Ligand SMILES: CCCCCCCC/C=C/CCCCCCCC(=O)O[C@@H](COC(=O)CCCCCCCCCCCCCCC)COP(=O)([O-])OCC[N+](C)(C)C
Ligand SMILES: CCCCCCCC/C=C\CCCCCCCC(=O)O[C@@H](COC(=O)CCCCCCCCCCCCCCC)COP(=O)([O-])OCC[N+](C)(C)C
Ligand SMILES: CCCCCCCC/C=C\CCCCCCCC(=O)O[C@@H](COC(=O)CCCCCCCCCCCCCCC)COP(=O)([O-])OCC[N+](C)(C)C
Ligand SMILES: CCCCCCCC/C=C\CCCCCCCC(=O)O[C@@H](COC(=O)CCCCCCCCCCCCCCC)COP(=O)([O-])OCC[N+](C)(C)C
Ligand SMILES: CCCc1cc(O)c2c(c1)OC(C)(C)[C@@H]1CCC(C)=C[C@@H]21
């Protein structure tokens with residue numbers, strides 16, 4: 001293998017003369033040495049076995065200003081000895097790198113000129129790469145282009161090569177990779193925001209679709225049942241989603257491939273009929289379901305401006321969800337009042353036994369429907385939220401924000417009511433402690449129903465983000481000081497002469513924690529005389545607790561100050577639109593078949609000749625940029 | 641460049657790529673490979689790690705006569721190098737610290753509210769227990785050994801205090817003293833009580849209150865709490 | 872910053888055998904007659920492109 005290793009060193013450096021020298025020798029060699037299987041042994045003297053790497057690969061992996069040459073001498077050599085098929089179509093063999101061919105290397109190293117040669121020489125254009133570096137799971141183990149040479153040219157912004165590969169036949173544009181993705185899914189995969197990758201996926205996602213001329217690639221489910229449209233929604237790619245929905249192909253013969261059919265235009269005013277094929281919840285998983293109920297991404301706020309949704313969210317509220325949100329509040333109001341107008345009349349007395357909420361049995365009519373409404377609606381929450389418990393594929397944060405703080409307290413409230421009626425039934429006196437939490441949890445949870453009511457809605461967000469993030473810290477350090485300084489003053493106190501009982505406020509530890517607790521809130525009375533060994537030390541630990549406590553309270557107002565000036569005006573108004581969206585859809589999931597169909601949005605359209613699809617009209621006004629409006633669906637400018 | 645605090649020049653010395661051949665040997669940014677956007681850059685750690693004597697990672701951190709030590713620690717054979725040392729060994733040792741310093745104050749505290757809150761003739765507060773059960777033996781004994789342990793150790797941090805330009809005040813030394821004072825007041829008392837003095841109680845109580853407030857120190861490897869203990 | 876002092880102050884404590892085990896780095900053939908420690912830091916960059924020529928090892932990736 002001396003001739004083998006030296007030719008590898010030849011393509012490496014760039015020595016063309018030294019290459020042509022051994023070029024003759026391998027030509028002189030194979031005629032008489034190891035004949036009768038010439039092209040196999042000849043190839044075997046070019047294969048870097050245990051890797052599959054041939055000379056042509058070794059040439060283009062290592063680019064030098066003298067590289068266009070060494071390719072040509074090997075290609076003309078492949079022509080003479082007739083190995084041109086297996087020569088170019090050879091691939092690596094190891095699992096870490098499989099399928100990587102010559103065309104795969106040339107498209108990466110920006111040698112677009114050499115690419116045109118290898119394609120014309122008969123390179124398998126619809127190649128693949130099913131290795132590990134080419135299908136990583138974690139980041140920074142490799143690069144996912146999509147197991148086609150076309151994708152690597154498009155993902156890496158090589159439009160000249162994409163056009164050339166595209167025009168050449170045998171270029172199956174409807175191909176599919178290992179994980180089922182076609183060329184369009186992969187472009188949705190590798191696409192970041194404008195801070196990162198500039199815009200070229202938006203431009204290259206356009207170029208392939210315009211020329212394709214069919215509703216084929218945009219309607220392909222990879223393996224898990226996802227189109228490029230749905231895939232863009234799940235991963236959280238906002239820029240590409242803005243294009244897919246609001247796509248106008250003004251050039252005729254491809255107006256059919258649009259979703260922005262302009263109904264008409266009279267000067268500044270125009271009417272754009274967007275489409276709602278797979279955006280509404282009529283079918284299975286859609287944008288409006290994925291965009292809202294997803295939690296594994298972070299930018300769900302920015303997506304809900306994209307505007308066959310925002311108009312679509314608002315109209316669902318005006319129709320049905322505004323009412324159902326209020327019909328909810330009236331029953332949940334009547335419930336707590338019922339639970340409360342039992343709790344302050346029957347428990348505040350004792351004869352032998354009161355039955356608190358059980359089957360009334362010797363009470364008037366007023367109290368029958370009272371107690372009965374509690375148990376049925378108590379079980380009703382107790383069941384329902386439990387399904388929301390179960391369908392809780394882990395909300396990435398936790399029980400904490402984005403919804404699940406509230407579905408538990410609803411659940412806990414329902415359990416504690418029914419739990420008590422079981423406790424009381426056997427014998428137990430523990431019924432009262434459960435009704436009282438059932439009130440206090442209930443009243444504080446009426447605060448929940450403030451989201452379809454604006455500015456209050458933003459206020460119920462700010463309280464929540466504040467009782468998760470800053471106050472929880474302040475307690476945790478306020479505990480350790482209180483419990484810390486609590487012992488110090490609870491131990492410095494000494495003998496309580498029984499002749500002078502209740503000798504001091506600070507006695508046991510339990511009293512020290514509270515009489516310090518009353519001090520913090522601004523309540524009670526203080527006298528530095530309490531029976532102690534050191535009245536000088538007994539105060540220094542107290543004035544200590546005043547200062548050290550006080551300092552954190554200033555860390556409080558500034559830590560929220562450093563939170564509110566950055567967040568509120570953008571934070572509250574936007575996540576409010578989010579949680580309001582879940583409320584709309586969650587009601588739409590409830591509705592029966594006949595009632596949902598009646599309230600289904602949309603209006604039919606003749607967007608083109610052989611094309612009827614749903615729509616949603618959104619008028620607008622625009623003055624700054626003008627045109628001689630030519631793209632009309634219907635020429636008559638206006639309604640009717 | 642590290643000692644004087646010159647950040648711009650340090651950014652160049654570490655991340656130097658001499659792409660032109662014949663002088664690639666003079667680099668510290670050897671690219672292992674590159675496949676399109678993804679690449680792998682093998683930076684160097686000749687005199688950046690603490691394997692040898694005074695280095696960047698020792699000078700950049702322990703220096704106080706400059707002001708811009710923050711901006712330097714982004715320069716990135718350090719930031720990656722700081723983070724990996726934590727994941728390996730220092731995350732654990734920081735928590736093994738907190739458990740013993742937790743068990744210490746609880747020990748010091750579960751003596752302070754049971755024996756001092758009574759008086760017969762004399763209680764021996766923390767001395768050699770001598771007619772107590774096993775629970776109280778390892779209790780008192782753990783206090784004195786670990787009390788001396790802080791009392792010694794921080795004292796070396798006292799001595800190796802080429803004046804931290806501010807003072808005892810910020811950038812570290814506010815906390816190494818209260819650790820020291822806490823350790824002194826405990827052992828100081830056991831000496832005071834030994835002779836005859838009644839002053840033992842006043843020292844145990846500061847030993848608690850200083851101790852509990854200094855548990856706030858151990859909040860730095862735990863993020864957002866860590867930023868709160870700075871503010 | 873203060874987190875950095877905590878890391879090193881612990882590293883100053885560690886005995887000889889335990890420090891050597893936890894020593895970072897990996898050997899490299901950066902050049903012909905040159906072996907030195909290293910630390911791999913991968914990255915991602917999209918805005919500026921080039922026909923990458925400066926390779927230590929030609930095989931693009933781990934292993
Ligand atoms: C976060 C902490 C937990 C939160 C809790 C939240 C709720 C607040 C909790 C309130 C509890 C209030 C007192 C309860 C009733 C008394 C019983 C008791 O506990 O004490 C008994 C023993 O215990 C002691 O004497 C305490 C000594 C150890 C202090 C531990 C503090 C740890 C904080 C570390 C923080 C780590 C920070 C880490 C930083 C990274 C003595 O009590 P007594 O005199 O025998 O009892 C009176 C008798 N009576 C009741 C009949 C009248
Ligand atoms: C024609 C009528 C036939 C009956 C249809 C019945 C349909 C009702 C649906 C599903 C039927 C099954 C009921 C299950 C009961 C428990 C569900 C539950 O929790 O509900 C909630 C109320 O949610 C509601 O949907 C309101 C229920 C009041 C009756 C509405 C009738 C009018 C609907 C047509 C109106 C058209 C008006 C538009 C203008 C033209 C109670 O709140 P919660 O316990 O905290 O629940 C969590 C959810 N939440 C926090 C987001 C609120
Ligand atoms: C600056 C203004 C803003 C901030 C202000 C600070 C805010 C608060 C910060 C911190 C809380 C501070 C603690 C206060 C406790 C005082 C009372 C005490 O310790 O002893 C007393 C009670 O003792 C108990 O009841 C023992 C504790 C029981 C466990 C429940 C703790 C409640 C905390 C829930 C946390 C909810 C978290 C949910 C929200 C996120 C006396 O003990 P006793 O003798 O046993 O009882 C007397 C009656 N008996 C003799 C008849 C039995
Ligand atoms: C194989 C084990 C053999 C033993 C090795 C012994 C090594 C220990 C080192 C030095 C030995 C000498 C000890 C001197 C005692 C006083 C020092 C001191 O203050 O310590 C501190 C704890 O600091 C620690 O280092 C933790 C000590 C607990 C034992 C750790 C054993 C596991 C080490 C291997 C773990 C590998 C796990 C990684 C995953 C694989 C106490 O806090 P402080 O008093 O306030 O001190 C100031 C410093 N501080 C504020 C920054 C915290
Ligand atoms: C008001 C914003 C939403 C809300 C509702 C609640 O029901 C409660 C909330 C918050 O905070 C906690 C969990 C601390 C409360 C504990 C006890 C009660 C009586 C109520 C709990």
Ligand SMILES: CCCc1cc(O)c2c(c1)OC(C)(C)[C@@H]1CCC(C)=C[C@@H]21
Nearest residue numbers: 544548818849850851852853854856857
């Ligand atoms: C909490 C942040 C760090 C800290 C720890 C402490 O130990 C103390 C701190 C601060 O402030 C002073 C010095 C005023 C305290 C004096 C008395 C006590 C009981 C504690 C002192």
